[PDB]
RNA sequence: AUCUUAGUUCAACUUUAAAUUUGCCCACAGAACCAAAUCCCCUUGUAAAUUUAACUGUUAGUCCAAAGAGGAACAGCUCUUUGGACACUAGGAAAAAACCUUGUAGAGAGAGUAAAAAAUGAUCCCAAACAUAUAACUGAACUCCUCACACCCAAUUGGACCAAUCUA
RNA sequence: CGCAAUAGAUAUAGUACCGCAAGGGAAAGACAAGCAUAAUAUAGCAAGGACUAACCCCUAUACCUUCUGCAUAAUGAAUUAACU
């Protein structure tokens, strides 16, 4: 024997250290620890996309709940806050709904106002003066 | 099973694309020049660009070598005293 | 089989001066500055293209 | 609102008993409302792992 | 078989009804096309992948400018279903050697100076 | 999400497109002096600059082509008059 | 000269400092890893891989 | 082509290094007497192509659209041709290699979109429901945003690093 | 710039043992897996996102090799250490 790996121990522990918290024989037997650790890291990588998707769907749910508390669906709130040129995103809308109820009450009132302005305008004949909140501000 | 039941959303998506491409049809039935007018107006730029490509392709060669780089490798034993 | 080159080999002293001189001397002939390599360690100047006779004459004129 | 810690925490996550009549109502609509309320999907503070569900009483 | 498509010229003939439907004019046409890609080159024949690679339209929407001359239209008539063409509008004229670094392209297709 | 409405009002479909949100300086110093601009703004200025230079270059080439055609029409339609004498 | 002046302010030359001229000692290739060796370059099954293909010119 | 179809050699395709200048797209013109399109080039959009030196590897694949020949114009049938996809990423149609959407790659607890919902025989039915509150919203690794970038194919090929041991 | 007790000779030995026989032919000496301390609690390639919180929620069709891709279609692996 001319050359023999003298440090296989550390190469094993580099992979077992990530498996101490697993369950079964696959937290101390390398042949199984490797496969499950690799699956673990692949899921760890692939899960960030789902993290973003899930937080966004949670925010949409919370905003739907808050907006329904004020007699106003979620399509209306977002599709008529932007028509008032307020670029509040959904994370901060959810935070406002939970932690600042009256500010969210005002935002819902603003959305309902703009919705009514839109309905009144479209109901009319022609280009009668625009609604007091429906006036765009240009850059 | 094999047949499908084309929805309304799909119809609306297809009509959106159809309208975009009809606008494309319109913006292509009026060219600024004609076949004969355009001929040659870009020749100078094309020739110069291809000459740039040629001069790039015909410049490959090994990089220089300096004595300083070779002697710098003696620094791998620099000591305090 | 297609890369032609010439080498001026036993160059001693500042090889960069010789590089500038050779570039000046050859640039009119080729219709462009000739690509070159300088190996300041071995002391050689390598030049793309075949210019052996021209360079021999030129190094004769300057008295080498 | 300046409530202490524990009282605030209790106030926010508390359970609320919602009555819901059903006379001449279709089962599906009552089911939709009951599903939303039982799950906790009417609370801006909702989450799946927080057990914010409420009580529903359909008579 | 499946083959390249030669579009009859009859389609590329603006009518008196089309002209007032888009902001155009038969006389005094428009210099430059602003073109964007709104569809994938994948799942389409190679003689469209190459055209798109040639017009600089490799990336997605990312608008790009081209001349309005038939030598380029012949290329855009092959990829007309993977692109949106709009006419560039210059209501302030070509910029000078000053105002090159302070331009902006609005969504309506107008190039303007200093936002 | 009102991209349809935003494009119907001459705005960018994407609020993170061009607007006060994306290109105004996100911060200044406390005293008031401005901050070294952000990388994204530099890159967008460079790309818009290249777009403008390409626009002017193509337009110039097309106009010069029209003028060249005019010159050729002159020197082929009129130089035939030089054969209408003697 | 010029280089001989450089050597004066560098450390002493010894067998701890030498080096090969760059570009001379091309690195070696061994079939280990996911690139060099999974089939080690010999291809799919077939007499090419086993090292039993006919004589040169057959 | 092969006592050959479980394989080999040549070609085609792939890779590296090197030389040079045209390569691709392409209107008008042009290609026979007995329908789709194809060939060929001026320009134009492009930046690639040919040549040389040196090696390995793959080779008679599946599905879908189309035109044919064989079996009905069927038997999910053998074969030829044009194209696409797969054997590479991701999202949809329920699960889903082959349909639709989408590619060049990292971090974000930001944003805009793409495709995408049905109408009126044999163990155990199979999401639950809903006729009428204004059409928009939801929806990706596509795109934008702040920062960073060599950091998502098999066979093969090129390159940058390197664990441990011996010797100077 | 030879090995150092699975290497180096097969070797502590051509002994023990196998074969009627020719013949074959060993082993070894100086906190790895497995368990206990401490059995388990709806749910499911046994993980990931996480979370105040271990489970509960959402996502998620094992690995190698061979066939055009293979839900495991088939072949191989109880597991550790050494040698390959
Ligand atoms: Mg999204
Ligand atoms: Mg070797
Ligand atoms: Mg031609
Ligand atoms: Mg991208
Ligand atoms: Mg021994
Ligand atoms: Mg032995
Ligand atoms: Mg142990
Ligand atoms: Mg099974
Ligand atoms: Mg078995």
CSV table of N, CA, C and O (backbone and C1' of nucleotides) in Angstrom, one decimal, chain H residues 129-157:
chain,number,residue,atom,x,y,z
H,129,A,P,-72.4,18.7,-1.7
H,129,A,O5',-72.2,20.3,-1.7
H,129,A,C5',-73.1,21.1,-2.5
H,129,A,C4',-72.7,22.5,-2.5
H,129,A,C3',-73.5,23.4,-3.5
H,129,A,O3',-74.7,23.9,-2.9
H,129,A,C1',-71.2,23.7,-3.8
H,130,C,P,-76.1,24.0,-3.7
H,130,C,O5',-75.9,25.4,-4.4
H,130,C,C5',-75.4,26.5,-3.7
H,130,C,C4',-74.8,27.5,-4.6
H,130,C,C3',-75.6,27.8,-5.8
H,130,C,O3',-76.7,28.8,-5.6
H,130,C,C1',-73.4,27.5,-6.4
H,131,A,P,-78.2,28.5,-6.0
H,131,A,O5',-78.7,29.9,-6.6
H,131,A,C5',-79.4,29.9,-7.7
H,131,A,C4',-78.6,29.8,-9.0
H,131,A,C3',-78.1,31.2,-9.5
H,131,A,O3',-76.9,31.6,-8.9
H,131,A,C1',-79.0,29.8,-11.3
H,132,U,P,-76.8,32.9,-8.0
H,132,U,O5',-77.1,34.1,-9.0
H,132,U,C5',-76.2,34.5,-10.0
H,132,U,C4',-76.2,36.0,-10.3
H,132,U,C3',-76.9,36.8,-9.2
H,132,U,O3',-76.3,38.1,-9.0
H,132,U,C1',-78.0,37.2,-11.3
H,133,A,P,-75.0,38.2,-8.1
H,133,A,O5',-74.8,39.7,-7.9
H,133,A,C5',-74.3,40.5,-9.0
H,133,A,C4',-73.6,41.8,-8.6
H,133,A,C3',-72.3,41.6,-7.8
H,133,A,O3',-71.4,42.6,-8.1
H,133,A,C1',-73.8,42.8,-6.5
H,134,U,P,-69.8,42.3,-8.3
H,134,U,O5',-69.5,43.2,-9.6
H,134,U,C5',-69.8,42.7,-10.8
H,134,U,C4',-69.9,43.7,-11.9
H,134,U,C3',-68.9,44.9,-11.8
H,134,U,O3',-67.6,44.6,-12.2
H,134,U,C1',-71.0,45.8,-12.2
H,135,A,P,-66.4,45.7,-12.2
H,135,A,O5',-66.5,46.3,-13.7
H,135,A,C5',-66.5,45.4,-14.8
H,135,A,C4',-65.2,44.6,-14.8
H,135,A,C3',-64.9,43.9,-16.2
H,135,A,O3',-63.5,43.9,-16.4
H,135,A,C1',-64.9,42.3,-14.5
H,136,A,P,-62.7,44.9,-17.3
H,136,A,O5',-61.5,45.4,-16.5
H,136,A,C5',-60.6,44.5,-15.9
H,136,A,C4',-60.8,44.4,-14.4
H,136,A,C3',-59.7,43.9,-13.5
H,136,A,O3',-58.7,44.8,-13.2
H,136,A,C1',-61.8,42.9,-12.9
H,137,C,P,-57.3,44.4,-12.5
H,137,C,O5',-57.7,43.6,-11.2
H,137,C,C5',-56.7,43.0,-10.4
H,137,C,C4',-57.2,41.8,-9.7
H,137,C,C3',-56.2,40.7,-9.5
H,137,C,O3',-55.3,40.9,-8.4
H,137,C,C1',-58.3,39.9,-10.1
H,138,U,P,-53.8,40.4,-8.5
H,138,U,O5',-53.9,38.8,-8.6
H,138,U,C5',-54.4,38.0,-7.5
H,138,U,C4',-54.5,36.6,-7.8
H,138,U,C3',-53.2,36.0,-8.3
H,138,U,O3',-52.3,35.6,-7.3
H,138,U,C1',-55.1,35.1,-9.5
H,139,G,P,-50.7,35.8,-7.5
H,139,G,O5',-50.4,34.8,-8.7
H,139,G,C5',-50.5,33.4,-8.5
H,139,G,C4',-50.4,32.6,-9.8
H,139,G,C3',-49.2,32.9,-10.7
H,139,G,O3',-48.0,32.2,-10.3
H,139,G,C1',-51.1,33.0,-12.0
H,140,A,P,-47.0,32.8,-9.2
H,140,A,O5',-45.6,32.1,-9.6
H,140,A,C5',-44.7,32.7,-10.5
H,140,A,C4',-44.0,31.6,-11.2
H,140,A,C3',-42.6,32.1,-11.8
H,140,A,O3',-41.6,32.0,-10.9
H,140,A,C1',-43.9,31.0,-13.5
H,141,A,P,-40.5,33.1,-10.7
H,141,A,O5',-39.4,32.7,-11.8
H,141,A,C5',-38.0,33.1,-11.5
H,141,A,C4',-37.1,32.4,-12.5
H,141,A,C3',-37.8,32.0,-13.8
H,141,A,O3',-36.9,32.0,-14.9
H,141,A,C1',-37.0,30.0,-12.8
H,142,C,P,-36.6,33.4,-15.7
H,142,C,O5',-37.9,33.6,-16.6
H,142,C,C5',-37.9,33.0,-17.9
H,142,C,C4',-38.7,33.8,-18.9
H,142,C,C3',-38.4,35.3,-18.7
H,142,C,O3',-37.3,35.8,-19.5
H,142,C,C1',-40.7,34.9,-18.7
H,143,U,P,-36.1,36.6,-18.8
H,143,U,O5',-36.8,38.0,-18.6
H,143,U,C5',-37.2,38.8,-19.7
H,143,U,C4',-38.1,40.0,-19.3
H,143,U,C3',-37.6,40.9,-18.3
H,143,U,O3',-36.7,41.8,-18.7
H,143,U,C1',-39.9,40.4,-17.9
H,144,C,P,-35.6,42.4,-17.7
H,144,C,O5',-36.4,43.4,-16.8
H,144,C,C5',-37.1,44.5,-17.3
H,144,C,C4',-37.7,45.4,-16.3
H,144,C,C3',-36.9,45.6,-15.0
H,144,C,O3',-35.9,46.7,-15.2
H,144,C,C1',-39.0,44.9,-14.4
H,145,C,P,-34.6,46.7,-14.3
H,145,C,O5',-35.1,46.8,-12.8
H,145,C,C5',-35.8,48.0,-12.4
H,145,C,C4',-36.3,47.9,-11.0
H,145,C,C3',-35.3,47.7,-10.0
H,145,C,O3',-34.6,48.8,-9.6
H,145,C,C1',-37.1,46.2,-9.7
H,146,U,P,-33.0,49.0,-9.8
H,146,U,O5',-32.4,48.6,-8.4
H,146,U,C5',-32.5,49.4,-7.3
H,146,U,C4',-32.1,48.7,-6.0
H,146,U,C3',-30.7,48.0,-6.1
H,146,U,O3',-29.7,48.9,-5.7
H,146,U,C1',-32.3,46.5,-5.3
H,147,C,P,-28.4,48.9,-6.5
H,147,C,O5',-27.8,47.5,-6.3
H,147,C,C5',-26.6,47.3,-5.6
H,147,C,C4',-26.5,45.9,-5.1
H,147,C,C3',-25.6,44.9,-5.8
H,147,C,O3',-24.3,45.2,-5.5
H,147,C,C1',-27.6,43.8,-5.2
H,148,A,P,-23.2,45.0,-6.7
H,148,A,O5',-23.1,43.4,-6.9
H,148,A,C5',-22.6,42.6,-5.8
H,148,A,C4',-22.7,41.1,-6.1
H,148,A,C3',-22.0,40.7,-7.4
H,148,A,O3',-20.6,40.6,-7.4
H,148,A,C1',-24.2,39.7,-7.3
H,149,C,P,-19.8,40.2,-8.7
H,149,C,O5',-20.2,38.7,-9.0
H,149,C,C5',-19.7,38.1,-10.1
H,149,C,C4',-20.6,37.0,-10.7
H,149,C,C3',-20.5,36.8,-12.2
H,149,C,O3',-19.4,36.0,-12.6
H,149,C,C1',-22.7,36.9,-11.5
H,150,A,P,-19.0,35.9,-14.1
H,150,A,O5',-20.0,34.8,-14.7
H,150,A,C5',-19.9,34.2,-16.0
H,150,A,C4',-19.7,32.8,-15.9
H,150,A,C3',-20.5,32.0,-14.9
H,150,A,O3',-21.8,31.7,-15.4
H,150,A,C1',-18.3,31.3,-14.7
H,151,C,P,-23.1,32.2,-14.8
H,151,C,O5',-23.5,31.1,-13.7
H,151,C,C5',-23.7,29.7,-14.2
H,151,C,C4',-23.4,28.7,-13.1
H,151,C,C3',-24.4,28.7,-12.0
H,151,C,O3',-24.7,27.3,-11.7
H,151,C,C1',-22.3,29.0,-11.1
H,152,C,P,-26.0,26.6,-12.1
H,152,C,O5',-25.6,25.7,-13.4
H,152,C,C5',-26.4,25.8,-14.6
H,152,C,C4',-27.1,24.4,-14.8
H,152,C,C3',-27.8,24.3,-16.2
H,152,C,O3',-27.7,22.9,-16.6
H,152,C,C1',-29.3,23.9,-14.4
H,153,C,P,-26.4,22.4,-17.4
H,153,C,O5',-26.6,20.8,-17.5
H,153,C,C5',-26.0,20.1,-18.5
H,153,C,C4',-27.0,19.0,-18.9
H,153,C,C3',-26.3,17.8,-19.6
H,153,C,O3',-25.7,16.9,-18.7
H,153,C,C1',-28.3,18.4,-20.8
H,154,A,P,-24.3,16.2,-19.0
H,154,A,O5',-24.7,14.8,-19.6
H,154,A,C5',-25.6,13.9,-19.0
H,154,A,C4',-25.9,12.7,-19.8
H,154,A,C3',-24.8,12.1,-20.6
H,154,A,O3',-24.0,11.3,-19.8
H,154,A,C1',-26.6,12.3,-22.0
H,155,A,P,-22.4,11.5,-19.6
H,155,A,O5',-21.8,10.9,-20.9
H,155,A,C5',-22.1,9.5,-21.2
H,155,A,C4',-21.7,9.2,-22.7
H,155,A,C3',-20.4,9.7,-23.2
H,155,A,O3',-19.3,8.9,-22.8
H,155,A,C1',-22.1,10.1,-24.8
H,156,U,P,-18.2,9.5,-21.9
H,156,U,O5',-17.5,10.6,-22.9
H,156,U,C5',-16.9,10.1,-24.1
H,156,U,C4',-16.8,11.1,-25.2
H,156,U,C3',-15.8,12.3,-25.0
H,156,U,O3',-14.5,12.0,-25.3
H,156,U,C1',-17.9,13.1,-25.7
H,157,U,P,-13.3,12.5,-24.4
H,157,U,O5',-13.2,14.0,-24.8
H,157,U,C5',-12.8,14.4,-26.2
H,157,U,C4',-12.9,15.8,-26.3
H,157,U,C3',-12.2,16.7,-25.3
H,157,U,O3',-10.8,16.7,-25.5
H,157,U,C1',-14.3,17.5,-25.6
